[PDB]
Amino acid sequence: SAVSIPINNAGFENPFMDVVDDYTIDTPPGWTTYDPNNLVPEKRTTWTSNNGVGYVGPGTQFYNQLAPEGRNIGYIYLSQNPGSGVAGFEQCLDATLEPDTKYTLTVDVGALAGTFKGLSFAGFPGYRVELLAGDTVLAADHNNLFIKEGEFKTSTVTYTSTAKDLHLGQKLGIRLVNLLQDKFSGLDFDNVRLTTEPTE
Amino acid sequence: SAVSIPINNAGFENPFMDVVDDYTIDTPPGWTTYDPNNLVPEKRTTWTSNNGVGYVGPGTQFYNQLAPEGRNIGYIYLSQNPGSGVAGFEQCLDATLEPDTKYTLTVDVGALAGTFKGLSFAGFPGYRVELLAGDTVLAADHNNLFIKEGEFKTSTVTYTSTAKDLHLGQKLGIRLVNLLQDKFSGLDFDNVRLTTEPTE
Ligand SMILES: NC(=[NH2+])NCCC[C@@H]1NC(=O)[C@H]2CCCN2C1=O
Ligand SMILES: NC(=[NH2+])NCCC[C@@H]1NC(=O)[C@H]2CCCN2C1=O
Ligand SMILES: [Ca+2]
Ligand SMILES: [Ca+2]
Known part of the structure; x- marks a missing residue:
């Protein structure tokens, strides 16, 4: 009964990566950098603040699972x-907030495990998953799940509109946020899904 | 196995109210105004921004239930x-953030139903329930539950610490926030509970 709203580059599968544990340092297409x-x-380098995609495939040295998707x-x-x-990814959708509708935003959240060339991946910065209408955060999961090194969990964010919601007709949006509340201060997301269902 | 951390005036039962649907307009003891x-x-009046307690008892004209507690x-x-x-209630606890501990913050969230002397109680401003260490929001539920006129739902906020959490030893705190994202822009809370459990 819930209908999916399409999301561009919803699984960070673009760009395609050839080598396990390789990564890009440029904003993935479909998304913008929330900063x-x-x-x-603007001029990206490794070992400075950046975002991109990472290939989490067979033989990864930094996870205890494959990519969620x-x-x-x-x-x-x-x-x-x-x-x-705080910083992360934003995507503003063509879909707009409709009245008497329940929205369900789901995303997998994870992080690196281990160490690399003297930099520890122990610790977690905190995450926040946001559903927007215009520039309003309708609903968000601020860091409620415990994200273990090298593993992913699913975050669920829900919002129910009314027939008179102030934000009706505004564009829906998604933010995936690194809260930078601790170190190691890298965070992963995958498999973004958004559904709509009329309320009874 | 989860241990309760005591909260001052956890159910907004102080001050005692004699008449159903009467209310105060001064910060309840145990809490401060987050503003x-x-x-x-600072000089409170009815019909302007305020906080306080309200007696939700038998014969209430504005709810479909009694107070949660x-x-x-x-x-x-x-x-x-x-x-x-945004504004609401804050309470900073004597309890401090401990390592390898799961915190569970639970609070009932509700709102008025109906109308009063020309002011409609239709609509909801959004809520956020926050668990703090020092001035850091460890975890929060930003408006994930649909809060129906005159009814309450339970919000659950969780945080798991590590052995090296940046915020270890800082005072825990609670905020109960009116997000002012729509009108009617009054919001209710009750029955604040916080538990701690060692992680396995
Ligand atoms: N392949 C992956 N799963 N992730 C790539 C993460 C890249 C990210 N950005 C960087 O510049 C490197 C520097 C060391 C730690 N890094 C990071 O955490
Ligand atoms: N008795 C209750 N359950 N709630 C009292 C709410 C009081 C709160 N503050 C006020 O000054 C009144 C003015 C009208 C609407 N009010 C409010 O919403
Ligand atoms: Ca993917
Ligand atoms: Ca109570």
Whole structure:
């Protein structure tokens, strides 16, 4: 009975990656970089704040599972110290907020395990998954799931509109946010899904 | 196995109210007014932004149930227009963040039903329930439950610490927030509970 709203590059499968544990450092297509505190440079480099896709496939050295979906995850890595701000992915949809409708936003959240060239992947920065109408956060899961090194869990965000919602007709949106509340301050997302169902 | 952390005036039962549907307009004891955008006047009046307790007992004209707990609920009413900011209740606890511990914060959220002297109680401003360590929001439920006129639902907020959490030893805190994202822009809370359990 719930209808899916299509999401562009919903599984971070674009771009295609050939080598397990390789990654990009440029915003994945379908998404924009959400960067209210100007943490992410326009000219991207490894080992500085960035986002992109990572190939989590057979033989990965940094996870205890494959990607939740397909080959790739999407990641946001912030090198600034905890407390410096929040950043992540945003996607504004063509779909608009409808009255007497329940929205269900689901996304898998994970993080690296282990260490790399002296940088520990122990610890987690906190995540927030947001459903938007216009620039309003209708509903969000601020860090309620415990995200273990190298593993993913599914976040569920729900919003129910009324017949007189202030935000009716505004574009729906999704944000996937690195809260930078601790280190290691990289975070992964995959398999974004959004459904709509009329209320009874 | 989960241990309760005591909360002062956890059910907004203080002060005691004699008459059903009567209310106070002063901060309930045990709590402070969270008011980052300076919406709430120090000199309180009815029909302006305020908070207090309300007696939701037999014969109430504005609910479809009694208070979730005891006689009273705690409310936050904001008369400013949607988008003006957020405000609510805060309580900072003596308890501090411990390592390898799961925290479970539960609170009932509700709102008035009907109308009063020309002001409609239709609509809802959005809620957020926050668990803090120091000034950090560890975990929050931003408006995931649909809160029907005159009824309450239970919000659950969870956080799991690590052995190296940045915020270990900082005071735990609770915020109960009116998001002022729509009107009618009054919101109720009751029956605040916080438990701790060691992780396996
Ligand atoms: N292949 C993956 N699953 N993820 C790639 C993560 C890349 C991300 N950005 C970087 O520049 C590297 C530097 C070291 C840690 N990194 C990160 O955490
Ligand atoms: N008795 C209750 N359950 N709630 C009392 C709510 C009081 C709160 N504050 C006020 O000043 C009144 C003005 C009209 C609407 N009010 C509100 O919503
Ligand atoms: Ca994927
Ligand atoms: Ca009570």
